[PDB]
């Protein structure tokens, strides 16, 4: 016990850095107010031009200023180590680039809180997104998951931080953190929890040097099921239970836990599954899931926090009278990269989709997709009376389950966010493994093609109804769509444009519909809000 953080405390930050031999120094000053979770800092590069983007360094450049609510004061390791302070060490893995390693001492000198850091970066690409300065200068946010490290009298933390790339895509930085106290005195060791962190980056008009003004909020939180509605907990469970049978099995848990962060091995996954399946029946029931949400703090905040759910109900029917393949149950694993063509002036979306068939253990018109195949996409839509059109082109590569599209709004400004149309705007380009080729309805209906219909239910907002014909005209695969949307809120997340420009991974669970000579599927899409 000793909260030197009752009122407003002055901060000093000093960083000495070396990334791929490019050395630099940063100095910062400002103030922290713990009782709100508020930091205000200005940082100067004192060595001229900073050889990495400012937002890569935000996390390195004072978690002692977090606001711990009254029910969590006994979980604040950071303040408990003051005034002698703590060592903070990290490794930060930039996906498809290099890594930073950092060591800092955070402590009081007089009445000023000081963060002193050495940072070493290696194996960066000289023209990747970091050394090539291809990151936007925006705002970053995330949740820092804290667990006790009893053996060092400290804490560990892990989190994935996303920063926007200039092309509209998203750069992942995987953080592994360790804190240990400098002095010998007692410290608070916490239950599992997280810091909700928002960072706002701006410039000072009156500063010539390379620099960053930072406004940051940090709030401690701990997920408790008692703080969520039956509806919210049901939804969360259904993300996991994507085959709809009412229980979570090991294959399901595998895929869906890996959406909470990139940091889990097959063994971590076996361990959490084993610990959550309290009666050892090989499935996680609803009650077991409730306790697993408190035990594994990332589950709810990462799957459902700041997320607009979109419930998809889908049906596919052949256009021709020819024989088709009606599959056994299975799913399509989807990953999606959204970006922007820097030379297109119209409102548009570049969409890259990776699609592979899974979920059956090894335990005719396919020939048309051997084959890089050109695509045409045409959508005409009406949402709450707002008319629009999209027209696009690209290519599908079935054997790598890859497709690329550029999609243009030809009616000016698109009155809904582009991500709400991703599922509407080519399942025939899935890669079906060799043991599942007899389960690929989509290719089997080509060249005459299939009708794809859906209803999409945006939680606490309106719905889209869609009908598309997917077929070959010549050597071009064509998706033609009508969409009708009703009962949207004019300032909800769709018509108010409050959805981020990125996309999560999802599994589409497919079952046969023998009575229609087709298939159906239902899946939940998770759209990030802001
Ligand atoms: Ca299930
Ligand atoms: Ca069980």
Residue numbers in the entry: 5 to 65, 69 to 370, 386 to 447, 451 to 555
What does the study report here?
Here, we present the crystal structure of Twitch-2B. It depicts the calcium-bound state and is, to our knowledge, the first crystal structure of any fluorescent protein FRET biosensor. We solved the structure at a resolution of 2.5 Å. Therefore, we focus our description here on monomer A. The crystal structure reveals the positioning of the donor and the acceptor relative to the minimal calcium-binding TnC domain as well as the structure of the optimized linkers. The major axes of the two fluorescent protein β barrel domains are oriented at a nearly perpendicular angle to each other. The β barrels barely make contact with each other, with a very small common interface (150 Å2). The interfaces of the minimal calcium-binding domain with mCerulean3 and cpVenuscd are also relatively small, covering only 257 and 351 Å2, respectively (see below). The linker between mCerulean3 and the calcium-binding domain (V232ADA) forms a 310 helix, which is tightly held in place by backbone hydrogen bonds from V232 and S236 in mCerulean3 to E301 and E239 of the calcium-binding domain. Next, the linker between the calcium-binding domain and cpVenuscd (P305IYPEL) forms one and a half α-helical turns, the backbone carbonyls of E309 and L310 forming hydrogen bonds to the side chain of R551 of cpVenuscd. With these parameters, using the Förster equation, E=R06/(R06+r6), the theoretical FRET efficiency, E, of Twitch-2B was determined to be 0.98.
